[PDB]
Design a protein around this ligand. Structure first.
Ligand code: FE
Ligand code: FE
Ligand code: MN
Ligand code: MN
Lengths: 258, 250
């Protein structure tokens, strides 16, 4: 069998990623799939690329924040929107440690990929197969949008990230649709669930008979340490970051994730 | 931390249920939640009840197949309707081992209950809070209907069974909605997923911080042995049971 960790929406959250990788290592994970949104608005730059480099990452797709980073260091962002001025500052922060060539590598990733496990075809994308941004696939998204994940082209299981919520539901034709949630910026609309902001990821396990396990995991990490790191590093918008990690609130005029 | 196994839609599948329970034991499960649809149209009768009796069952709700059994043994079914003829024959098979008193106990179970883990409230029902049958919460179900699980009364996480598919989705207000799928009659609309008819169930784990794990599991079981059991015990509609366990068509 093959045990796969889905890593999504790290968003530069160094301590959360380190904790998730420690959890996956102890589970004997065989490979990693990277669903995108790797850097920003969190602390990690070189550290995150270094940590990912040590992994057997066998599948990687492009997140909207990779496009944002690329346009951001090319000064191609719309200055008139408050969220884009926030983003510009996060891009400058990243550029301090990450080279333009490395950002080119981040940008040059496919939107959608496919992998085969026996009888099963798995589709993989950050959001929609042809569109890594937007609100189409949120918790209340239209069924016809979900169906885009698993038809034209077809697959039996689709995995996506982007919305920062864990998920297991279906295409109209019964195809599985799963989401690991977010390692670094987990999102909850429910106030009681929002009290627990541990990292989200998931494990897929395939064997000779098919998909044997879908484990939606939560991983504790030292939030105090991540926040102290953000101070020490002069991370822009410390209070926005604090809010995201401690109270789980995100903002249209800051992150504008969706 | 507390580790809870959710058991649903056993539908008399003795061998599947034994394999799931062995899996849960090996995982060190602390308690079991039983979501209903215990007997029929599978092999198991006394053995299923004995298996369940050994379990620390901390939550239990009424499935529609419990009502169907109760109605069946009350001589209310009309065999001129094919679905009722089928059901009546399954009830006859159950009655060979299971007493009316035991059926009473199966039938006397609440439709919806709630359980508390620190800050989190969990709602539990077979299908809808006040309706354990129907198609409201199928995979393409209306959001309005899903929201019924987590509002009036409220909960933060709702668990249900009945549709025989594993699920993790949300109420409009972000409340979790989960489904372990079916132990004895796993259901797939997708023809490729249907090539794997291992038992379905799930584990929830709660700790001091909240909900730490939702593990949607598949458990291998000896289908041949279950079908051989069906032959030896003279189970009605063998060909229908065969198709359900081998090909997954209903
Ligand atoms: Fe993201
Ligand atoms: Fe059922
Ligand atoms: Mn995204
Ligand atoms: Mn049912």
């Amino acid at each position: 069998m093959t045990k796969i960790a889905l890593l999504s929406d790290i968003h530069g959250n160094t301590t959360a990623l380190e904790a998730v990788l420690a959890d996956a290592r102890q589970l004997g994970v065989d490979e990693y799939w990277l669903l995108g949104d790797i850097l920003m608005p969190g602390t990690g730059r070189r550290r995150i690329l270094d940590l990912l480099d040590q992994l057997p990452i066998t599948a990687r797709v492009l997140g909207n924040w990779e496009d944002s980073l690329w346009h951001g260091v090319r000064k191609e962002l719309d200055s008139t929107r408050p969220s884009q001025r926030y983003l510009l500052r996060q891009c400058q922060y990243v550029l301090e440690e990450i080279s333009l060539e490395e950002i080119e590598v981040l940008h040059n990733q496919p939107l959608q990929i496919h992998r085969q496990f026996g009888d099963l075809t798995v589709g993989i994308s950050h959001h929609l197969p042809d569109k890594n941004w937007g609100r189409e696939l949120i918790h209340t998204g239209k069924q016809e949008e979900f169906d885009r994940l698993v038809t034209h082209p077809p697959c039996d299981i689709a995995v996506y990230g982007h919305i920062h919520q864990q998920l297991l539901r279906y295409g109209t034709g019964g195809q599985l649709i799963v989401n690991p949630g977010s390692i670094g910026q987990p999102f909850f609309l429910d106030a009681q669930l929002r009290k627990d902001l541990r990292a989200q990821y998931m494990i897929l396990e395939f064997d000779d008979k098919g998909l044997v396990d879908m484990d939606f995991r939560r991983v504790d990490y030292d939030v105090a340490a991540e926040l102290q790191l953000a101070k020490d590093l002069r991370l822009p918008y410390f209070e926005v970051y604090y809010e995201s990690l401690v109270n789980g609130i995100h903002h249209t005029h800051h992150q504008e994730f969706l």
